[PDB]
Structure 1
């Protein structure tokens, strides 16, 4: 009996460690004897340790995660794809946590519950990746969402943070209701919620004239929920406001991990299921809309956070092009784009968090940065050029596959749109470089140097961004492996 639970050792450990940290934090934060010490950094270090131990347990027990698969079948499904997805999610959570300590001590954000909520949301996203039934998927999505709602409003006396939370909760709850409605329609039409059963029922028919309008609209509503989650246009406008109004570590965490988890879900639901061309057209139209609107709106922005939010919207458009074309290379390119976008976003938010110690808000606040911190201005410039997709930086991979998918599938309008939006993006990315290197403002802002954690993370992500295309084989192989494991 005990050995059956080897399939959930990683999750058991992280949940138990989260409980231990909750108890530790609440017991000593309330201690008069110890004079109510702030425990955000102490619990943060212990939680980083817990995340790393979870990663060790998961990575080193690759075969064991598939033990007792028949017993666990109606609860979740662990395979090669979920293996690598969960590893990448844990690595992202560890990096995001490591970027938070200067924020904890200098702002004096003393709430250790922040770390606990991050860990519980990580548990939720882990269960999201392995979900193999509509019920499990919904429950894990809701756990993740509720944790985000709470942490988005963590600055509870701030107008901005409270506004972010309110908008997030209302729009999140609305989208979740729409998705749940879709799930109910699919169950009513097919008598099934398990992904295997849905695959068997729906395969071979798609729209064979006598199409289940119940099945067709259930798929549509579920897709609407998914598109809200990935911040695809027109279900996107929550994202810029929430990203700007939340505390910056929250914004960094939301920018990466939920995308990993929800794309895992989207792959395993749609790609593994079957209504077909309709849904790929959904993601097609939403990709084009996201690219255009992200480019234009980002061009309008004068503030750093809003610029990065709109940039992420545009990039999810680029990524969803891969899901749309419905090929093994499409899935592989989508995974490559997520990995690279995640490492670039981690780099960018490490810089943003470093600069938030002097309250960076506007793009113009970067003036004369090439004088006051030359190596920081260069590092940030490499990130921008990578965001623009200039070769041979890592960001060039997404542009290359965008045009690779258009030319082959025959999509000349998509290629047109990609060219235009890439040029617009390059303009608003090099505007930052111009501000740091070319401008001569009358008043300068002198920034405090970053802590060791962010400097090390920045140093590694900056080598990756510059040097990835010298040795890209492991990512290429691992992502081809994952794309294949979805069906075999």
Structure 2
């Protein structure tokens, strides 16, 4: 034969082929050699995740193309999201290598799962088919089940894995039932930009079976994004999983699911916009209302960050709701880019605090300013950026998200977003209020015996690449959007 048609198409997924090669090389070296070294695992994970971006940036100017016979679409929209996934993995590897090593467990398996979830998240970003919109998030969800229970000994992690596996088998089967309904009442078409035509060809675009597919797809996607009553999987899993994996599932899962939701609600479901618009409006209003209200009654930091994430996802949903006309998708990014730094910094501070301290309760965060002023300053900056406080990234991100909402006439959505943002100050201020307690009687012995130690550690560099971003991107919110309105 020629092996050429696939060879020229195989260069289009070369950034993912780099991840696959790094995965295989890491696995082969782990199997071949008995001894284990932290620096080599660090090097291979980093050089796998900094060569994919090197190849992806070299592929930015290239023409958009649909390769592997209607299976992989490369254009401007998915490239940004793939870069976001790679950035999340790159800033989560230092979060993971220290944490899993301090738990005395095998780390090559953890890096393998993270790299596979990144590989399955990059494929979900451009997945121009219905089979690969199922297989790729099953390359992510299965690894997420393998993660978050990698602890394997804590009684919390087993229950978290049970809940995650059962609820994500409940979803991603409703999603595929919707895929089957959409594929049946279309004429046997599965490519994304070929089933609206197939629907007209069979004249079933107003069939009652199309509403079932839309509802099932929206439910199966809103499970992964976790807005609205599809949110219950989030806090328990966020409360009973190791911190690096939950940070990864906080930033990497929302990016891939946002990309899939944007490419599944606009390309194959534009004829029925008046239905999924209402579904997303309900899904967002309920998300902000019931993610900002419950977060103010939280005694655990990871669970509070879970309710925080299910609150901030509703702000991003407005970008899908307004549509591509009044910016819209250009406001999904330039806020998800913000959200990544916000959450990864506020999780890196939690990682360091828990490792040096050994706790997760919020009440043990008292008096951290006296012990480690740098960590308290960084965590406070991350939390204030999370609350949309003025000189930090969240404020400009939220006003960008609300400008397009007001421009599209969605006064109710913007009003609910602003009211929930007001509610979203009491938390992200409660933690700081604890952090600035000089009362020695209210200071828990968890932070009384706290050693900062005269070494830098990797997470400090990883969140110094972040805290300086959530504050100094506030002038650079003109460079980012001109890369995000350029896509269409």
> Common fold, TM-score beyond 0.5?
yes
Instruction: Give 1:26 deviation, angstroms.
Output: 2.3
| 1:437-476 correspondence to structure 2 within 5 Å | 437-438=436-437, 440-442=439-441, 443-444=443-444, 445=447, 446-449=449-452, 451-476=456-481
2:127 corresponds in structure 1 to 131
| 1:195-274 correspondence to structure 2 within 5 Å | 195-201=192-198, 211-273=206-268, 274=270
1:111 corresponds in structure 2 to 107
Aligned equivalents of 2:403 and 2:182: distance in 1? 35
| 1:346-357 correspondence to structure 2 within 5 Å | 346-357=344-355
Aligned equivalents of 1:204 and 1:401: distance in 2? 40
Instruction: Give 1:41 deviation, angstroms.
Output: 5.7
Aligned equivalents of 1:245 and 1:197: distance in 2? 42
Instruction: Give 1:470 deviation, angstroms.
Output: 1.5
Aligned equivalents of 1:97 and 1:307: distance in 2? 23
Aligned equivalents of 2:467 and 2:248: distance in 1? 19
| Distance change in 2, residues 1:467/1:174 (3 Å) | same
Instruction: Give 1:399 deviation, angstroms.
Output: 2.7
Answer yes or no: is the 8 Å Cα contact 1:7–1:64 preserved in 2. Answer: no
1:343 corresponds in structure 2 to 341
1:34 corresponds in structure 2 to none
| 1:142-181 correspondence to structure 2 within 5 Å | 142-181=138-177
2:428 corresponds in structure 1 to 429
Answer yes or no: is the 8 Å Cα contact 2:405–2:411 preserved in 1. Answer: yes
SS at match of 2:79: helix
1:306 corresponds in structure 2 to 303
Instruction: After superposition, give the CA deviation of every residue in 1:21-49 in whole Å (9 maximum; x if it has no partner).
Output: 11211222xx3xxxxx4456632431121
2:117 corresponds in structure 1 to 121
Instruction: Give 1:460 deviation, angstroms.
Output: 2.5
2:77 corresponds in structure 1 to 81
| Distance change in 2, residues 1:49/1:478 (3 Å) | same
Answer yes or no: is the 8 Å Cα contact 1:85–1:129 preserved in 2. Answer: yes
Answer yes or no: is the 8 Å Cα contact 1:40–1:109 preserved in 2. Answer: no
2:87 to 84, 91, 96: 91
Aligned equivalents of 2:74 and 2:274: distance in 1? 28
2:323 corresponds in structure 1 to 326
In the alignment, is residue 479 of structure 1 matched against residue 484 of structure 2? Answer: yes
2:26 corresponds in structure 1 to 21
| TM-score, normalised via structure 1 length | 0.91
| 1:361-376 correspondence to structure 2 within 5 Å | 361-376=360-375
2:396 corresponds in structure 1 to 397
Q: Once superposed, what is the RMSD of the aligned Cα atoms?
A: 2.2
Instruction: Give 1:316 deviation, angstroms.
Output: 0.2
Instruction: Give 1:222 deviation, angstroms.
Output: 0.7
| Distance change in 2, residues 1:269/1:70 (3 Å) | closer
Instruction: Give 1:407 deviation, angstroms.
Output: 3.6
Instruction: After superposition, give the CA deviation of every residue in 1:185-230 in whole Å (9 maximum; x if it has no partner).
Output: 01110021111112434589999xx711112211110111000010
SS at match of 1:3: helix
Aligned equivalents of 1:87 and 1:70: distance in 2? 19
1:359 corresponds in structure 2 to 358
Instruction: Give 1:98 deviation, angstroms.
Output: 1.8
Answer yes or no: is the 8 Å Cα contact 1:176–1:225 preserved in 2. Answer: yes
In the alignment, is residue 287 of structure 1 matched against residue 306 of structure 2? Answer: no
2:48 corresponds in structure 1 to 50
Identify which range, 138-147 or 435-444, moves more after superposition.
435-444
2:58 to 42, 56, 60: 60
Answer yes or no: is the 8 Å Cα contact 2:71–2:129 preserved in 1. Answer: yes
Aligned equivalents of 1:436 and 1:399: distance in 2? 26
| Distance change in 2, residues 1:335/1:63 (3 Å) | closer
| Distance change in 2, residues 1:409/1:58 (3 Å) | closer
The structure with the greater share of residues assigned to helix is: 1
Instruction: Give 1:245 deviation, angstroms.
Output: 0.8
SS at match of 1:426: coil
Answer yes or no: is the 8 Å Cα contact 1:39–1:112 preserved in 2. Answer: no
Answer yes or no: is the 8 Å Cα contact 1:25–1:39 preserved in 2. Answer: no
| Distance change in 2, residues 1:154/1:454 (3 Å) | same
Aligned equivalents of 1:229 and 1:340: distance in 2? 20
SS at match of 1:14: helix
| 1:407-426 correspondence to structure 2 within 5 Å | 407-426=406-425
Unaligned runs of 5+ in 1: 32-36
Aligned equivalents of 2:200 and 2:120: distance in 1? 30
Answer yes or no: is the 8 Å Cα contact 2:318–2:413 preserved in 1. Answer: no
Instruction: Give 1:177 deviation, angstroms.
Output: 0.8
Answer yes or no: is the 8 Å Cα contact 1:403–1:415 preserved in 2. Answer: yes
Answer yes or no: is the 8 Å Cα contact 1:41–1:101 preserved in 2. Answer: no
| Distance change in 2, residues 1:62/1:400 (3 Å) | closer
Identify which range, 460-469 or 183-192, moves more after superposition.
460-469
Instruction: Give 1:307 deviation, angstroms.
Output: 0.7
Aligned equivalents of 2:185 and 2:147: distance in 1? 38
Answer yes or no: is the 8 Å Cα contact 2:367–2:436 preserved in 1. Answer: yes
Aligned equivalents of 1:283 and 1:178: distance in 2? 17
